[PDB]
Automatic annotation (TrEMBL):
The gene is chnB. Belongs to the FAD-binding monooxygenase family. NADP(+) 1 binds at T182, G183, T185, Q188, R205, T206, W488. InterPro entries: FAD-binding_Monooxygenases, FAD/NAD-bd_sf, Flavin_mOase-like. It comes from the Bacteria. GO terms for molecular function: flavin adenine dinucleotide binding; N,N-dimethylaniline monooxygenase activity; NADP binding. NADP(+) 2 binds at T182, T185, R205, T206, N432. This is Cyclohexanone monooxygenase. Keywords: FAD, Flavoprotein, Monooxygenase, NADP, Nucleotide-binding, Oxidoreductase. FAD binds at G15, D35, T43, W46, D55, T56, Y61, V108, L433.
Length: 531
């Protein structure tokens, strides 16, 4: 005796919160949501590591769809910490009475399409079964935990924390900590842990490029000036490419004098923001090799000013293309001048084994550790889809459908899987994410309503349309240097995972233009089954 509902939503982050609001409050459908978390927040429920903070400016790292909720927003700094975002997202849940629609502490273990009924059968880890005509997957593009295995790790004194599963209230003051990982998460937790711990050991494998964040206090008059121009601010954001609120440059870097190139880089550096350094200074830093090297070397010279010990600056000096997700920090490079901060270059002096009481290097040197923080990445974009049994038409598994690379049509849809939608699924926009999540959930909500109104019982894309979208994303990505960034953005960070394109990099405005032309062209690329 399964529970019948119109729509199932998986995940209670940004995407699920909004999807439950659109499907129930606006369209009046019966909806059930799920999250293995005990409450809402998604990313910001799980990542409670110290230093966790958004690189989207405070006034734009939030929903834009409700004007009253925009005029009630509050914040203290130019950027916003994890406890502030979790609080904001919880406030959205109470504001729209969404809580009662969500089954928390529950994991969706299977999602099986029943063709003869045109219904999805969704079963959970608690034993309950549901049947729905629509399924909306908001399972998170940076959500499936990546946890590398090390020799003898099952045999260790003390705790092993992956940053995306940090226990609330855990403080490491006065302890002896090691951190592995030098991406955005590692930098934040290294910078936050340095003043409190008595010895920090950073196992650095690939040092990265990072600019100052510039997180400045915000006055009431500043907030009010933003609130009285919210419409135009969001209008410009949604028409732009990366949607961070700053003017995106079209000036080629090597077309100006060396002094002007320096002046522009130094202005962004002093202002702050990783995305602004990459896209707000010149227009070809991500597509022109000479422009990219000008940006990379300017950052290197700054790191050489900061880190006094030249041998310490050597291990932390980033080489190669400036083509990973732009990073910014609250004083990351100054940490290594502290006497109680050690850097270990893992590529020269590798990790050999985890002992009972610490980590041994091929140094013939053990580093004792009360705690070992894992600042490693995510099985990004497609990870949380491959972890569960998703079968569509003819019972074809999602892993067999996504045999090689994960694919979509327009980032929100895939073939053989009718009435089945993805928020931040494969081959979607690469922007400030809340306004791209809103764009997707809005199109998904409008597409369900169109099915309900015109009596369609199954919508799904054609293989021809899906392959056309893959090619469109592949051609655009091949015009950039991100394809050679060697990061999670192209699926190169998980061993066993085959690299591929994973993002449409045409920008949010072009993406929204593509979605609107698809709808106006009577859902071009979509097969409709009626009656
Ligand atoms: C530390 C950090 C900082 C970031 N900073 C920024 C930033 O400044 N700007 C920006 O644009 N983006 C940022 N991001 C990225 C992005 O904005 C967030 O990941 C965003 O909140 C995604 O929202 P979501 O709802 O799509 O997914 P998530 O927040 O990841 O929510 C997915 C949810 O689905 C649940 N789930 C998955 N599978 C199942 C299942 N089988 N059953 C039940 N529940 C399931 C998970 O528990 C999770 O709670 C950051 C990400 C991280 C990790
Ligand atoms: N906006 C924000 O402030 C913010 C903050 C945190 C996260 N994020 C988002 O989340 C993404 C991922 O961030 P993240 O830093 O958690 O992930 P990440 O970019 O994948 O970083 C993983 C780190 O772990 C290292 N590592 C991986 N496997 C290892 C192994 N087997 N042994 C040793 N070291 C290993 C990596 O080194 P290698 O490079 O050598 O592989 C890297 O330094 C970011 O790009 C960003 O989109 C955003």
């Amino acid at each position: 005796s399964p529970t019948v509902v119109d729509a199932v939503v998986i995940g209670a982050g940004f995407g699920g919160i909004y999807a439950v609001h659109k499907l129930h409050n606006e369209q009046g459908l019966t909806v059930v949501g799920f999250d293995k978390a005990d409450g809402p927040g998604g990313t910001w429920y799980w990542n409670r590591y110290p230093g966790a903070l958004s690189d989207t400016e405070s006034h734009l790292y939030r929903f834009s769809f409700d004007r009253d909720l925009l005029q009630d927003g509050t914040w203290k700094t130019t950027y916003i910490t994890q406890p502030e975002i979790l609080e904001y997202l919880e406030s959205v849940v109470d504001r729209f009475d969404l809580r009662r629609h969500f089954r928390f502490g529950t994991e969706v273990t299977s999602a099986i399409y029943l063709e003869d009924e045109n219904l999805w059968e969704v079963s959970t880890d608690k034993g309950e079964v549901y049947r729905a005509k629509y399924v909306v997957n908001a399972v998170g593009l940076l959500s499936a935990i990546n946890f590398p295995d090390l020799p003898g790790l099952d045999t260790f004194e003390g705790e092993t924390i992956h940053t995306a599963a940090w226990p609330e209230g855990k403080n490491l003051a006065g302890k002896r900590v090691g951190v592995i990982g030098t991406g955005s998460t590692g930098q934040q937790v290294i910078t936050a842990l340095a003043p409190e711990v008595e010895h920090l050991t950073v196992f650095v494998r690939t040092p990265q490029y990072s600019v100052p964040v510039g997180n400045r206090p915000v006055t009431k008059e500043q907030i009010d000036a933003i609130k009285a121009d919210y419409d135009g601010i969001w209008d410009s954001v949604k028409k732009s490419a990366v949607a961070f609120g700053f003017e995106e440059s079209t000036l080629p870097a090597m077309s100006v004098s060396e002094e002007e190139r320096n002046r522009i880089f130094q202005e962004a550096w002093d202002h702050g923001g990783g995305f602004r350094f990459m896209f707000g200074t010149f227009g070809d830093i991500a597509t022109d090799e000479a422009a990219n090297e000008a940006a990379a070397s300017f950052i290197r010279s700054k790191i050489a000013e900061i880190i006094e010990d030249p041998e310490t600056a050597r291990k932390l000096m980033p080489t190669g293309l400036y083509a990973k997700r732009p990073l910014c920090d609250n004083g990351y490079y100054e940490v290594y001048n502290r006497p109680n901060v050690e850097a270990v270059a893992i590529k020269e002096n590798p990790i050999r084994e985890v002992t009972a009481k610490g980590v041994v290097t091929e140094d013939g040197v053990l580093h004792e550790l009360d705690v070992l923080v894992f600042a490693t990445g995510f099985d990004a974009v497609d990870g949380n889809y491959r972890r569960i049994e998703i079968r569509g038409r003819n019972g074809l598994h999602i892993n067999d459908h996504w045999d090689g690379q994960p694919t979509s049509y327009l980032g929100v849809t895939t073939a053989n899987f009718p009435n089945w939608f993805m928020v931040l699924g494969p081959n979607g926009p690469f922007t400030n994410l809340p306004p791209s999540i809103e764009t997707q959930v809005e199109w998904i909500s409008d597409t369900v309503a169109y099915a309900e109104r015109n009596e369609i019982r199954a919508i799904e894309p054609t293989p021809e349309a899906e392959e056309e979208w893959t090619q469109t994303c592949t051609d655009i990505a091949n015009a950039t240097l991100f394809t050679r960034g060697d990061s999670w953005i192209f699926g190169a960070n998980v061993p066993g995972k085959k690299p591929s394109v994973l993002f449409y990099l045409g920008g949010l405005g072009n993406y929204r233009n593509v979605l609107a032309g698809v709808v106006a062209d009577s859902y071009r690329g979509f097969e409709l089954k009626s009656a």
